[PDB]
Amino acid sequence: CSLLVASLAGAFGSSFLYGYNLSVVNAPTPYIKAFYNESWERRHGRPIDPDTLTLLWSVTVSIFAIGGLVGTLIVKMIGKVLGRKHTLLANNGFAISAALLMACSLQAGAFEMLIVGRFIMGIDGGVALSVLPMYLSEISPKEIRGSLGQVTAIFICIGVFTGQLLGLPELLGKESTWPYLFGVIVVPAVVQLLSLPFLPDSPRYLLLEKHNEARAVKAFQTFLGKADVSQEVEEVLAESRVQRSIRLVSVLELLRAPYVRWQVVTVIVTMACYQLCGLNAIWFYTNSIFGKAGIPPAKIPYVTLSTGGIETLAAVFSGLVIEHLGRRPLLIGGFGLMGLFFGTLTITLTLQDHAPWVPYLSIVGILAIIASFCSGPGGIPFILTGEFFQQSQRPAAFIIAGTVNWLSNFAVGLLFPFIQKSLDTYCFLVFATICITGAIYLYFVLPETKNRTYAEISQAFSKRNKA
Numbered sequence: 448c449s450l451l452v453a454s455l456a457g458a459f460g461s462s463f464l465y466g467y468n469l470s471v472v473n474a475p476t477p478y479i480k481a482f483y484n485e486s487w488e489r490r491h492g493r494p495i496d497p498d499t500l501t502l503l504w505s506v507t508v509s510i511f512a513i514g515g516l517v518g519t520l521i522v523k524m525i526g527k528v529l530g531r532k533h534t535l536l537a538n539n540g541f542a543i544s545a546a547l548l549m550a551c552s553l554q555a556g557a558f559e560m561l562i563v564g565r566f567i568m569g570i571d572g573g574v575a576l577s578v579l580p581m582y583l584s585e586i587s588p589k590e591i592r593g594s595l596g597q598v599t600a601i602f603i604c605i606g607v608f609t610g611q612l613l614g615l616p617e618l619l620g621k622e623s624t625w626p627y628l629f630g631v632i633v634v635p636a637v638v639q640l641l642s643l644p645f646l647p648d649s650p651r652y653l654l655l656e657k658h659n660e661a662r663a664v665k666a667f668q669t670f671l672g673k674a675d676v677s678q679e680v681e682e683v684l685a686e687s688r689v690q691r692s693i694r695l696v697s698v699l700e701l702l703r704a705p706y707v708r709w710q711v712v713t714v715i716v717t718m719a720c721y722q723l724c725g726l727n728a729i730w731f732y733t734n735s736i737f738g739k740a741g742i743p744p745a746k747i748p749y750v751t752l753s754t755g756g757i758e759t760l761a762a763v764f765s766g767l768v769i770e771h772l773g774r775r776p777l778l779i780g781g782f783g784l785m786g787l788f789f790g791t792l793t794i795t796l797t798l799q800d801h802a803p804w805v806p807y808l809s810i811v812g813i814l815a816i817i818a819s820f821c822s823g824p825g826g827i828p829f830i831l832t833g834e835f836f837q838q839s840q841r842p843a844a845f846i847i848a849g850t851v852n853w854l855s856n857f858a859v860g861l862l863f864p865f866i867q868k869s870l871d872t873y874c875f876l877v878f879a880t881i882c883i884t885g886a887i888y889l890y891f892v893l894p895e896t897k898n899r900t901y902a903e904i905s906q907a908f909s910k911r912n913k914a
């Protein structure tokens with residue numbers, strides 16, 4: 448009851464918006480480009496030559512990455528005081544401000560407004576996904592935590608799906624309706640503001656430093672559905688004592704430490720390959736990719752909808768495949784299948800003219816690419832990242848992984864149009880090479896981590912640390 452309500456509310460407040468804004472920029476792309484052309488003609492009197500327009504569009508699409516980067520560093524200062532629930536409500540405030548700055552951008556005719564709104568709502572994204580997971584884990588019993596991890600994954604997926612859905616030409620794709628594309632964001636924010644504050648805070652947050660015994664006890668009683676929660680309180684107090692008995696280590700000291708150099712290189716490379724694979728690239732430029740494959744323009748939005756649907760279905764299937772296959776074989780198989788399907792995509796795009804039914808092969812290839820992603824390395828890199836380190840929840844680790852995550856997303860978003868401009872019919876070879884290289888590296892380096900203690904994996908890594 449209360450558990451499910453809180454889970455749905457938090458996910459809808461943060462991860463749903465992140466997924467929506469991940470793939471809401473593709474459907475109105477031609478209209479926004481026309482707006483850029485018109486605004487520049489008004490302001491300067493000279494039309495934009497196409498490469499400058501493509502660069503401006505790339506900046507607009509990819510500045511979300513820098514927004515998320517600065518979010519995943521402002522969260523460190525915010526969470527020390529604002530907690531979890533109030534942090535999510537402030538996140539809601541960013542969402543309101545950013546959505547309103549989006550909606551009024553067209554009529555005012557100042558694209559600077561759109562850029563600043565994108566940056567703010569990117570800060571929203573980085574504050575969202577670094578506060579939601581801890582809250583979701585903390586408000587749930589031990590036996591269900593993995594289920595809520597799959598819940599946040601599924602809500603990100605459904606946010607992407609509904610973003611690809613609302614971009615349909617009939618609903619919110621017309622020339623007189625596209626501003627409502629960044630005006631829908633108000634509703635999830637409003638419902639989150641109306642739902643979340645009527646729930647108890649994070650009990651762990653209330654007991655680690657707030658020391659609110661009665662409030663924490665009430666929160667455990669409400670969330671766990673039982674009045675016998677003293678054992679959990681004692682367990683979390685013991686965990687707090689253990690953590691306070693261990694000295695914290697800084698990011699710079701962690702980097703200078705020789706016994707975790709291989710671990711940090713592994714996590715950095717895993718994040719770089721998980722975000723340079725190009726799934727976010729397709730999510731941003733699905734319309735352009737499917738148009739360049741020879742599919743008639745009359746059906747591209749529907750095929751994009753199919754992409755979103757299969758991506759959500761792959762998430763649902765992964766939610767159970769993960770618990771039974773593993774981590775290292777799953778990651779290696781996912782990246783290798785990414786490479787092979789990128790090869791079949793380029794062999795079906797290079798010779799699209801030979802037969803009429805080749806674009807259908809392109810669609811099937813993209814289908815399988817997204818399925819292999821979302822059922823494979825789609826979610827594990829966010830668990831394995833903690834799993835490497837001995838502490839297993841290192842803020843330095845989550846600072847050194849998120850930085851590379853957001854910078855790689857920035858690189859992909861700002862360079863994919865130019866990659867296409869260079870390699871119209873081969874632009875997926877670069878992503879295929881990246882994916883295969885990542886697969887090779889993590890096959891020769893990363894050892895299996897399921898049902899393994901941190902001591903054994905530390906021993907295996909030290910076997911290569913030469914120390």
Ligand SMILES: O=c1cc(-c2ccc(O)cc2)oc2cc(O)cc(O)c12
Nearest residue numbers: 576600603604762821825826829852
């Ligand atoms: O927890 C996360 C989950 C996802 C994700 C995105 C798409 C999927 O089909 C499954 C998971 O991306 C992320 C990207 C980030 O930069 C940070 C995350 O925590 C996540």
